[PDB]
Amino acid sequence: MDIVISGTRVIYKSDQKSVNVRLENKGNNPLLVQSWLDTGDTVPFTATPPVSRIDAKRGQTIKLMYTASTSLPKDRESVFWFNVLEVPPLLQLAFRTRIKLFYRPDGLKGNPSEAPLALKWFWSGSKASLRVTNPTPYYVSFSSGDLEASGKRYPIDVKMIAPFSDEVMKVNGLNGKANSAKVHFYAINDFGGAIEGNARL
Ligand SMILES: [Cl-]
Known part of the structure; x- marks a missing residue:
């Protein structure tokens, strides 16, 4: 192009x-x-x-x-x-x-750059995936994210999540829920810059 x-x-x-x-x-x-x-x-x-x-x-x-x-x-x-x-x-x-x-x-x-922090993350059962809930009036968009457990990292197929909605996002290379897992991500701000975030499951 x-x-x-x-x-x-x-x-x-x-x-x-x-x-x-x-x-x-x-x-x-x-x-x-x-x-x-x-x-x-x-x-x-x-x-x-x-x-x-x-x-x-x-x-x-x-x-x-x-x-x-x-x-x-x-x-x-x-x-x-x-x-x-x-x-x-x-x-x-x-x-x-x-x-x-x-x-x-x-x-x-609230503020849009804070909406990624407001997301709530959950294991979605059984082919691992996460259910993500956005309680805000703002979209959240991501450039990348992953799930970590016991030192192994599994990329998340991140998706945009609309205001006041849920989305399920696939976890690559992980069979089922892992113990003490953490989510890490980079969301995208209004200017295209990164918003780092994390959550413990
Ligand atoms: Cl985007």
């Missing part, structure tokens, strides 16, 4: 009339580029310009705008996908990249 998005996620605070996302063409040829929002494969947003020509080594700011055509919840975050599809101007190959957009109503309890 020649088109690069500035940032690995977008935060859309509800009091903003719009939010900008920047695209850059790092490649050597110009590209036709489409930008849009969807729910992850209708959506109360526009992205403009929806189609642009971005020359080599030049860029384009995309304006994302909430339309309230549908009302989003005001008591929790909502997540969307910001998509970018490039194609060089017969038959032709093209490429698509997506990053998350979190719609964040103003005034939610």
Whole structure:
């Protein structure tokens, strides 16, 4: 992919009339580029310009705008996908990249960077897995995580966990519950940086 998005996620605070996302063409040829929002494969947003020509080594700011055509919840975050599809101007190959957009109503309890600490973790029985509960109004997203017991480490197939919900996450290479296990993880903050955390099962 020649088109690069500035940032690995977008935060859309509800009091903003719009939010900008920047695209850059790092490649050597110009590209036709489409930008849009969807729910992850209708959506109360526009992205403009929806189609642009971005020359080599030049860029384009995309304006994302909430339309309230549908009302989003005001008591929790909502997540969307910001998509970018490039194609060089017969038959032709093209490429698509997506990053998350979190719609964040103003005034939610607590802070999003603290939501990973608030997660509760449980063994999920029998093919080991964990049940994880998010008591907060924020998504929690991870870059990686693992379970450790008796000096052995087992990667977790981490998944994003929605506000006020449970998710089960698989533990790789572990048959069943281990004694005195601990979870360690790196969640992702608004700026794409790491939030380290841990929990004892
Ligand atoms: Cl992510």
